[PDB]
Amino acid sequence: EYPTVDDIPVGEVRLYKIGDGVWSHIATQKLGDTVYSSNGLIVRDADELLLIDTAWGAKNTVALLAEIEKQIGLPVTRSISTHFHDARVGGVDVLRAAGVATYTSPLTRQLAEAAGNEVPAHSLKALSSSGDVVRFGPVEVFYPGAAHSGDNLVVYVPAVRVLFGGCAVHEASRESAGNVADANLAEWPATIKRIQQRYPEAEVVIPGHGLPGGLELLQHTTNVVK
Ligand SMILES: [Zn+2]
């Protein structure tokens, strides 16, 4: 049932229910030749929603808000971007215009600014060193160390044991690491092991791109990176 690039045109967004009060959002973007599918997360907290990652640019992020209003009907009040690439902060200006309080790690804000990308408005201050973890509403945000990028974060929803790995985690079908220009290939396996050790009871693991799986995606990622 999980949507792929073939099911979603650029500019549309689908939601997919993952567990109680947890959905992923899936969108499509085209970079020159390449067409990607990309996942974020939505998590209910009382009568509001926490959003993890934009839908890759302003147009998709507008469609994301519309689809949330249509399907869920609760307001997105806060967001977290999991790394500095346009794929995850592109659209933060749409979120700000809709009144969302946008957050990420201080390092992500710095890298986004350096890259000329959109910059979330607020910093999650206790996330500075590999291993740092903070609670934020109904999730934990974990900085496990450098991997796909130096700043990449993962997000865990403890009530339902759902781990959003973002682009630090590859889907089962993926056999190459993608854009490695900001990656730390040497550190990535150790970063994965840190995720494994922290969330040994996770039931679903959602990669940055492609099909959700279980904890097996973590070791798979290490194998690919090598
Ligand atoms: Zn990226």
DSSP 129: S
Q: Can you tell me the distance from the alpha carbon of 169 to that of 55, in angstroms, rounded to the nearest whole number?
A: 18
Question: Tokens in use for 96?
Answer: 């700000």
Residue type, 37: S
174 phi and psi angles, rounded to 5 deg: -75, 135
Distance of CA 46 from the midpoint of ligand 1 (Å): 31
Neighbours of 80 (CB within 10 A): 27
Distance of CA 203 from the midpoint of ligand 1 (Å): 24
Question: Tokens in use for 17?
Answer: 């229910």
Question: What CATH number should be reported for the domain holding residue 6?
Answer: 3.60.15.10
Query: Which residue shows structure tokens 């990669």?
Result: 207
Distance of CA 31 from the midpoint of ligand 1 (Å): 13
Method: X-ray
Distance of CA 80 from the midpoint of ligand 1 (Å): 15
Query: Which residue shows structure tokens 């790690």?
Result: 105
Distance of CA 178 from the midpoint of ligand 1 (Å): 9
State this model's resolution in angstroms. 1.8
202 phi and psi angles, rounded to 5 deg: -60, 135
Asked if 21 and 160 count as a contact pair (C-beta separation under 8 A), the reply is yes
Q: Which residue range is the domain that position 39 belongs to? A: 1-226
Q: Can you tell me the distance from the alpha carbon of 94 to that of 58, in angstroms, rounded to the nearest whole number?
A: 6
Question: Tokens in use for 67?
Answer: 């689809």
Buried b (16+ CB within 10 A) or exposed e, 167-197: bbbbbeebeebeeeebbbeebbbebbebbee
Domain total in the chain? 1
